[PDB]
Amino acid sequence: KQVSWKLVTEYAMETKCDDVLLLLGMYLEFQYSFEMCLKCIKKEQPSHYKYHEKHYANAAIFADSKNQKTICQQAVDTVLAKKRVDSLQLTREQMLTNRFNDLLDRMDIMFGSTGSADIEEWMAGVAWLHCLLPKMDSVVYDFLKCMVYNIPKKRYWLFKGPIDSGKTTLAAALLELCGGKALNVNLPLDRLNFELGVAIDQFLVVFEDVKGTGGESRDLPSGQGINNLDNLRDYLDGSVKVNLEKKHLNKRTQIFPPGIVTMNEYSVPKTLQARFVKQIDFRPKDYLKHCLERSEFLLEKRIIQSGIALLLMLIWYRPVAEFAQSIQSRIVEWKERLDKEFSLSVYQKMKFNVAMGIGVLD
Amino acid sequence: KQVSWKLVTEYAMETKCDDVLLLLGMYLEFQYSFEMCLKCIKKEQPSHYKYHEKHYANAAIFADSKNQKTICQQAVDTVLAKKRVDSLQLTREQMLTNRFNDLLDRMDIMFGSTGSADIEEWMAGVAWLHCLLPKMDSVVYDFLKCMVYNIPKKRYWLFKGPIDSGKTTLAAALLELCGGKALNVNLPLDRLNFELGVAIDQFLVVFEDVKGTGGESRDLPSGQGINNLDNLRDYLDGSVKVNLEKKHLNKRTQIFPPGIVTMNEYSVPKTLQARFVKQIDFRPKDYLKHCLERSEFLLEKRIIQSGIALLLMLIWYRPVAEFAQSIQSRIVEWKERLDKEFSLSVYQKMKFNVAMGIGVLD
Amino acid sequence: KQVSWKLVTEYAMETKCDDVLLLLGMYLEFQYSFEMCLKCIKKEQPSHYKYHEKHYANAAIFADSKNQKTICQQAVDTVLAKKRVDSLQLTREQMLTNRFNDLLDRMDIMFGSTGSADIEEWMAGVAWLHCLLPKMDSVVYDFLKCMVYNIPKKRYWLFKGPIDSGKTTLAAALLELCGGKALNVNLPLDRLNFELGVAIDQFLVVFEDVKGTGGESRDLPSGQGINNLDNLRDYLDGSVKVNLEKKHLNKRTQIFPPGIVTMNEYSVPKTLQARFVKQIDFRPKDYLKHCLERSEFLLEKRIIQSGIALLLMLIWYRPVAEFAQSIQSRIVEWKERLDKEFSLSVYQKMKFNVAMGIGVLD
Amino acid sequence: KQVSWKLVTEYAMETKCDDVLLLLGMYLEFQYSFEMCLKCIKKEQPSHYKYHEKHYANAAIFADSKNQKTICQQAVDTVLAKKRVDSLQLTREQMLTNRFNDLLDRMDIMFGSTGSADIEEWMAGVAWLHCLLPKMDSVVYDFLKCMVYNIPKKRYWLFKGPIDSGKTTLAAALLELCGGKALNVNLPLDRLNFELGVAIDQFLVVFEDVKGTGGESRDLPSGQGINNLDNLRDYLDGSVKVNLEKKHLNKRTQIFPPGIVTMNEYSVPKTLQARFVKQIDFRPKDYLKHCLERSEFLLEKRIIQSGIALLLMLIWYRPVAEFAQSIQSRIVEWKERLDKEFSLSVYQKMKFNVAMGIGVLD
Amino acid sequence: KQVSWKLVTEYAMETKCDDVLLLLGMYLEFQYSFEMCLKCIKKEQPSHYKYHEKHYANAAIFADSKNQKTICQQAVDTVLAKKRVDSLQLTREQMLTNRFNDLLDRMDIMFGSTGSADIEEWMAGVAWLHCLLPKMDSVVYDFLKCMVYNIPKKRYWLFKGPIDSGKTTLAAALLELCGGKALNVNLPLDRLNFELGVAIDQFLVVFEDVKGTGGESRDLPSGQGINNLDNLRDYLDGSVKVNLEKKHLNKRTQIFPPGIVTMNEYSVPKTLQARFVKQIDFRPKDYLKHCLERSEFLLEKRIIQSGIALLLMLIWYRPVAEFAQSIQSRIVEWKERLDKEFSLSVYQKMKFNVAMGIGVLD
DNA sequence: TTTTTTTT
Ligand SMILES: Nc1ncnc2c1ncn2[C@@H]1O[C@H](COP(=O)(O)OP(=O)(O)OP(=O)(O)O)[C@@H](O)[C@H]1O
Ligand SMILES: Nc1ncnc2c1ncn2[C@@H]1O[C@H](COP(=O)(O)OP(=O)(O)OP(=O)(O)O)[C@@H](O)[C@H]1O
Ligand SMILES: Nc1ncnc2c1ncn2[C@@H]1O[C@H](COP(=O)(O)OP(=O)(O)OP(=O)(O)O)[C@@H](O)[C@H]1O
Ligand SMILES: Nc1ncnc2c1ncn2[C@@H]1O[C@H](COP(=O)(O)OP(=O)(O)OP(=O)(O)O)[C@@H](O)[C@H]1O
Ligand SMILES: Nc1ncnc2c1ncn2[C@@H]1O[C@H](COP(=O)(O)OP(=O)(O)OP(=O)(O)O)[C@@H](O)[C@H]1O
């Protein structure tokens, strides 16, 4: 005859929600009967229909409470506490294990009985992506190994090119894949003091196509970032600890995470060059767009920005044993359906419709 | 007995109120008898007279409680929470369809028994507005589609032309028809990052005054607008989610909305030009001013500015199937109602007067 | 026994008070017996002596309470809430009608039994100010109409002229009449952003001595205001709902009020001038100064710059039907009073003394 | 039947937790059945499996409670209170003796049944560090006693050597062993004071990379460092208290702690030279870079940066009497353990392997 | 039973503790039995062992409070309130008498039977300082009287002479004796406004090492602070009250405190020279330098820095009558104690050794 | 937390 605060907490755990208003807004829906709830009937959203019928009576009494935001705040605190625990006890390999499970859990629905997606679209996706550079699957598996291990110095690859050279949209799917974020390294000095606080608890950090002053001799806007890598001595090795701030109040001490440098094709000297111990580059190879613009759903669905395509790329082109061991059955359970549905010729079809700039579908 | 907090929550939901002071003011009105209420007799506000009798009982107890702003805070939090659920979960088309239901429910009132305006004059508004630029109902439908599918790069159009060319009059009606928001461009980014924060969930946003180059002949300056938009070279398209600031609440990393930029005439970099998947050209038509000069209620009652007038245009022009798929019974009902009083000959009699710069009314 | 919170709230409505400290200070005074209250017996302040005897009974029990500031806080919210509902729902005619009722209430008090100033003196002010310009009375009415209708791009009047042309003297009386506020755009361009925020929910605004540049050719200092108004163009014509700022607060979004600009004879780009309705150029005249010299009681009582003096003039110069229907009864009452109080020989003697540069009384 | 706040307070004390979320999260884990607990079974995290049983019943009741965060804030404040009492009351020698127990605890975990570490690899790092400077153990012992006594003027050590000559490494190891912080002083002269706000209540500081001037004749980029130090004699002499700029807060007043200075081979004023107790020169050596080049696990596991290696070195070389009388017991235990785990030939060969520049292990 | 908040407030008063965490931490220690308390047994900390037995019974119940930080805040605010009362009422003479009573209590502990110090080593310091300036004891007594009478214009003292002439040593001893703060006026003109806020409610201030202009002709590095002191006239003169500010606070108005100024041999404008009462020249004395190294326990223990040392000099040299009346009783007992410990021959032997340049103890 | 501070 009172609200059970624990049931709300369990719902917050099961959803892994951490926004007090989202939690409140969704949980109130359960006060009407699940039996008539159009959302329950039409199978619209997992985070509703999976739970409505369970939480129903408590949601009704919840709708009569007077403390509603208070309950919700404690629930949000539970999930933030859980995250804080995990972020300090575990190591990067378990983190990755879980993060992949999450993506796989999603694919398990998207292409599942909802019919809400056909994976073939993403197959055309991976086919485009694979042609970005040789064995992109292997380039990624190698990058994964690196920034899992977070070994000293071996912590920063690079992407070069001119502008409009894919290195941003590539980084997007990798930032997605990791839970990383990026740097406006060109900022002015006191802004530059406190951009850095983004790095708090981040898996990776990325340099946003850093700019050389006088690069306008190459029509490159002559921003500050490459000079600023002079001051940024040690963060790329990450072998001494630092403090961090977002201005005035948001502060903590940590090691500076690894990640990826990128630049447009300014010059770079040894003192800065070696700081990103590894390098790669890409450039516009317009037929690839000619496929996309004849495969437009790839971009309408921004698939070439999404990390789930990278996971799918890795799934087919990585041997099942290469994975973390515990999950590896799920890898088989997906490998099965790629084995079922695709000949490697049909994989190649897409990759070379791509390589022609021809629309993959035919 | 006691104040039902639930009943207040309902009234806030019903009204979709989200300012705590407005809500408190509204609810306290009901504490007198609805039986005698002048505002009810006057039929002055729907948000009052529809509800006064229903809530009178609970308003009586509400008036005595020593805790009133706590009730109203929780109610306002409920409405904010509702908006946040939808922010994530709705299709863009459903969002737009809700916006239309709201507008149509006002047109019920204005042109209803309240007599508070006459759609005669608003359809003269349609006549005036349809004279602005060709096929205007059709051009609007193209903009709506581009915004609903929200496809990469296919996200922004530019309005360009001299002063008193209505480019902003049009932009204003489009913001209303969506519920969009507006932004400046002529600042250093540091503060403007917070102004951009207004976008933190908006279907549509608009920028004005590129402050482009050239212009010294046109009586126009160059400055930070054109400096800034090209500097964040993708951000307007927003291929990638990016962090965004609001006071007290978290900084939000999200896709930036689609919409419009408008300018008096300057050069446009081909880079920036390529983000504008359309540009549309505006000019004076002094006879339209003369029609307005002979049709001044078109500005006094702000009809020429209203998204309502664009919605009216789309009603009396577009075929019923082009709409969203649930609401079409509304669309049919208004199309029928219109020619209970209009004939296309009289609708052209307005277009007649308009094109001559003659006053619409006879 | 117990404090009645509603009786406190009624007094805040009755007084239209909205500072917590002012409200608290007022109500505490009711604790002593009105039966002896020296303020009552001297009839000093109406907001006291009108109410003391009613509120005394509740004030005694309030005087003991431990909650006091919270009782006051809820009341101040109730008044601020009433203002928001009103500002969102009344027409500008009704708002202005309310303003006149408040001013007329003060006038009844001033010339009541306390009688603390003489109507003879205030009419010298009326004579003095109708003297200041041709058809002064009618120009005032024309401004009020414009503020009431708030016709877009017909929203601002320019007062231009040297120092001691009286433009602030006129503008101050206009501002007291409509209850606007004053702003200073002669600022660093960012400071405008908080500064212009004071217009939130105001009826009218004035900008003071908006500086151009190069005016030292005619001994004027040079400055920013004009160029800042060029930046502010959107706010001026009242096209669309811009938004406004406060410390520790989210923005509020609305049309920006109509208003006055005062200026020395800088140059103006007609691009800007074209956006006024109308202008008045102010031209100093000797006899006014001699008149004031011998009429010192005018300035000490601040008469010539008070909106009370303007209201008196309209009661004199205008026909009854020009005012709104509700107040016309009070208008008739005030016209009736004046006609007992004066003869045109008296008022003509005043204007003759003013023309003759005498002290106004003889 | 009710939550014991005292039991949470014990846990917070025993685990020395000072983050309310870390505390909240881990305590919540205890609600699930201890008898089955996989974390306990896998003996994974000491802070769990040592405690889960004792706290279980109270943790279950805590899971219901409506007030969880308040309990945790009280608990955390109790821990912070302990740090303040200890900070103000202990001798420097006791503070060090605490840090030793804290690290020895962690070693008992690592090389215990948890098996998370291999003591042989850790002994390999000790040899490489020991070869970095002659008589390294006695150098380190001298340094520690110097910090413990903190005899004024006799307070600072100077590390000179070319880049990639290890001076950053050794500083980092020392700083981890003692818990100080580090400072940049190539800043311009003003905000040095805000920088020095860092030092408040720290045990050590390190001045990294102090730029001289004219060193650019040897490509050493010139800057503010040296001449900033030549001001600061009083801070370095440690003779009397100084004041430090915390941002947003008042200055606070204390003895400025001892520390380490590092540089490439800039020239130094005699005035500054005289403040150091002792200079250590560092030089790059081929066999070391070659040995590191082979012995990858050292760097992957960041062995040579970590203070655990220094403690192992002290234990391996130095008599029990040299350690604080209390913890000598743990020293004796660790001596016996290490002796059993390493016959001298093992260590001697490993050190000889370092000398060859081959991998340390054969 | 329930917590006595009164007993906490008494403890906070008697320890004069005004840090909430320190108060909390100290009180918590008492919760264990005083009978066995090792801190009591070893008499390590007076604020514990004097109090543990008294407060024990309440410490237990406090340890069960769910309200602990509130009890502490109320107690701590009682300590803060008493200081505001005192500063706004006490005579400067009584302030000094309080300050001596505090110092005399430390000396009772410090040379107490458990104390670490010995009176002989400290008296060696007194002999050395009496050599530092002719008539040293009288100079101190003159300075103290001047601070107590605080006579306008007749307020400020100048210490002048080359680096390593002991002026900071003497200043620090004086500053401990009286209480006060350092300040640094070498800043640029604006930040001074916060610097000077440090003076708020202080008894003394000391201006560190003000730098002049052109002294590099004598190697003296130039700076702003001399010219700033030109423009601090009313602060120095103390004739009228002034306004002071901190961060994040509104200005505070008071008489600016008296104090000391320290500098190298820059030339002083005759104007500023006129504001000082007294100039004292400090010059190097190599025979002190030779002595000091032979007497290093003075530096090691910071004896020559301390107000404690000065008070021994005063107690030695000056008549009992000269001290403030109440503490004369305590003072007599210290003179008696000192006379027991040293015959004048001991003192003579020491002081002779200093003058010889010989270790102060033969 | 933002605003003032911090910064420039
Ligand atoms: N290999 C490629 N084939 C086809 N198009 C490409 C290729 N590389 C880049 N492009 C074009 O570049 C566009 C933008 O790429 P991206 O956002 O990654 O740029 P970027 O190199 O990171 O640029 P910037 O340095 O300016 O931020 C893509 O949408 C695509 O049109
Ligand atoms: N196509 C048009 N032909 C003639 N007059 C027009 C036209 N469109 C707008 N007007 C006139 O322009 C006046 C101002 O319109 P509006 O503010 O929309 O102009 P704008 O050119 O879009 O402005 P801005 O310079 O701010 O971009 C209207 O009141 C109307 O009289
Ligand atoms: N038209 C006038 N002719 C002569 N004297 C005037 C006139 N108007 C005002 N005065 C005198 O000048 C004084 C100042 O008037 P007011 O401040 O309104 O003038 P202003 O032109 O608006 O000045 P400013 O630009 O300095 O604000 C009045 O108090 C009165 O004494
Ligand atoms: N004595 C040495 N001989 C050769 N290589 C060395 C030596 N000491 C360190 N190294 C290499 O130099 C790298 C960096 O070491 P470290 O940062 O301690 O040097 P540093 O002289 O302080 O450098 P810097 O002044 O550039 O920061 C080490 O990780 C190791 O690879
Ligand atoms: N009269 C003196 N003659 C020689 N050496 C002295 C003398 N007085 C002090 N010293 C030495 O100078 C050291 C520093 O003393 P102190 O800080 O008081 O000097 P200072 O001249 O006031 O310095 P600063 O101006 O740098 O603050 C002392 O510890 C002592 O070793």
Curated annotation (Swiss-Prot), chains A, B, C, D, E:
* Tree of life domain: Viruses
State the Gene Ontology terms under molecular function: ATP binding; ATP hydrolysis activity; DNA replication origin binding; double-stranded DNA binding; helicase activity; identical protein binding; single-stranded DNA binding; zinc ion binding
Name the cofactor(s).
Answer: Mg(2+)
Catalytic activities: Couples ATP hydrolysis with the unwinding of duplex DNA by translocating in the 3'-5' direction; ATP + H2O = ADP + phosphate + H(+)
Annotated residues for binding of ATP: 161-168
CC per GO annotation: host cell nucleus
> Binding to host TP53 protein: where is this region?
72-362
Keyword Zinc set for record: yes
Zinc finger (T-ag D1-type) residue numbers: 1-92
Any one of the GO BP annotations:
symbiont-mediated suppression of host innate immune response
The UniProt note on how this protein's activity is regulated states: DNA helicase activity is inhibited by ATP-gamma-S.
Q: Does the keyword tRNA processing apply?
A: no
Q: How is the cofactor bound?
A: DNA helicase activity requires Mg(2+).
Location comes to: Host nucleus
Q: Where does Zn(2+) bind?
A: 37, 40, 48, 52
Write out the PTM section of this UniProt entry. Answer: Phosphorylated on both serine and threonine residues. Small t antigen inhibits the dephosphorylation by the AC form of PP2A. O-Glycosylated near the C-terminal region.
The EC class name is isomerase
Residue span(s) of domain SF3 helicase: 135-295
> What are the alphabetically sorted keywords of the record?
Acetylation, Activator, ATP-binding, DNA replication, DNA-binding, Early protein, G1/S host cell cycle checkpoint dysregulation by virus, Glycoprotein, Helicase, Host nucleus, Host-virus interaction, Hydrolase, Inhibition of host innate immune response by virus, Inhibition of host interferon signaling pathway by virus, Inhibition of host JAK1 by virus, Interferon antiviral system evasion, Isomerase, Magnesium, Metal-binding, Modulation of host cell cycle by virus, Modulation of host E3 ubiquitin ligases by virus, Modulation of host ubiquitin pathway by virus, Nucleotide-binding, Oncogene, Phosphoprotein, Transcription, Transcription regulation, Viral immunoevasion, Zinc, Zinc-finger
Q: What is its EC number?
A: 5.6.2.4
- Which coarse location class describes where this protein primarily resides? host cell
Q: What does this protein do?
A: Isoform large T antigen is a key early protein essential for both driving viral replication and inducing cellular transformation. Plays a role in viral genome replication by driving entry of quiescent cells into the cell cycle and by autoregulating the synthesis of viral early mRNA. Displays highly oncogenic activities by corrupting the host cellular checkpoint mechanisms that guard cell division and the transcription, replication, and repair of DNA. Participates in the modulation of cellular gene expression preceeding viral DNA replication. Isoform 17kT antigen targets host RBL2 for degradation and promotes cell proliferation. Transactivates host cyclin A promoter through its J domain.
Q: How does it assemble?
A: Isoform large T antigen forms homohexamers in the presence of ATP. Interacts with host HDAC1. Interacts (via LXCXE domain) with host RB1; the interaction induces the aberrant dissociation of RB1-E2F1 complex thereby disrupting RB1's activity. Interacts (via LXCXE domain) with host pRB-related proteins RBL1 and RBL2. Interacts (via C-terminus) with host TOP1 and POLA1 allowing DNA replication. Interacts with host TP53, inhibiting TP53 binding to DNA. Interacts with host preinitiation complex components TBP, TFIIA and TFIID to regulate transcription initiation.
Any other comment in the entry? The sequence shown is that of strain 776.
UniProt free text on domains? The J domain is essential for multiple viral activities, including virion assembly, viral DNA replication, transformation and transcriptional activation.
Q: What is this protein called?
A: Large T antigen
Entire protein: shown range: 266 to 627 of 708
